Amino acid sequence: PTALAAAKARMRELAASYGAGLPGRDTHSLMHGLDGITLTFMPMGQRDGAYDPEHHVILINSQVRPERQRFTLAHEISHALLLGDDDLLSDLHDEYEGDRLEQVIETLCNVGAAALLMPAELIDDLLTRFGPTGRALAELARRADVSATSALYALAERTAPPVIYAVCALSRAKELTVRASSASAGVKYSLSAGTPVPDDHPAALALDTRLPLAQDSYVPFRSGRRMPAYVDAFPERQRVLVSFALP
């Protein structure tokens, strides 16, 4: 495939080895894989974290929320993994340079973080037990301790059937707003952020009543187009996680 795709595959492999060598993907456990590399939590203003290879240390901004710290850490770990791999690093140079190379490496580090926080096996186990549903999305976010959007993209990327995933919050039976969305492999239909969700829609229903719903419904495209699909909404603390199964 493309150079950026081969690099991603490789990054997913690096992250999987390091990950598979741990006792789970909890924070403290990710730290422990650090084979003689210092790790420090300290205030760093607006910067989230940094990796200093010469000093063999990873720095995490102690001022940000724990969710982003866990992420920033998976990210710097990826960064170290990438910089430790000479075949990968060289092929990148063969294809990029200057700021274009920095941005690509930043992108790979994000792909690596994800693979590390959300292993292919944990996602598949959830797809099996819960199906491609709001319920699964909700499980993955909690068990993985990552944001809804991280889970949204992880989940959709390993989904076989055509499905739309959405995270909704109160725009405030009250009307929601799509915050983030994502489609599986072959769906081209996208549900954009900003998209209002009607009160009568199962997603609004589930939230305002804190009751997992599931039933035949429609994708509420902001165009007015009402595409039928099976909907599974899993309501929680102020968000609702939804899947739209397209025939």
Swiss-Prot record:
GO terms for biological process: proteolysis. It comes from the Bacteria. The keyword Protease applies. Its EC number is 3.4.24.-. Interacts with DdrOC. Composed of three structural domains: an N-terminal zinc-peptidase domain, a central helix-turn-helix motif, and a C-terminal GAF-type domain. Plays a central regulatory role in DNA repair and protection pathways in response to radiation stress. Acts as a site-specific metalloprotease that cleaves and inactivates the repressor proteins DdrOC and DdrOP3, resulting in induced expression of genes required for DNA repair and cell survival after exposure to radiation. This is Radiation response metalloprotease IrrE. It comes from Deinococcus deserti (strain DSM 17065 / CIP 109153 / LMG 22923 / VCD115). The gene is irrE.
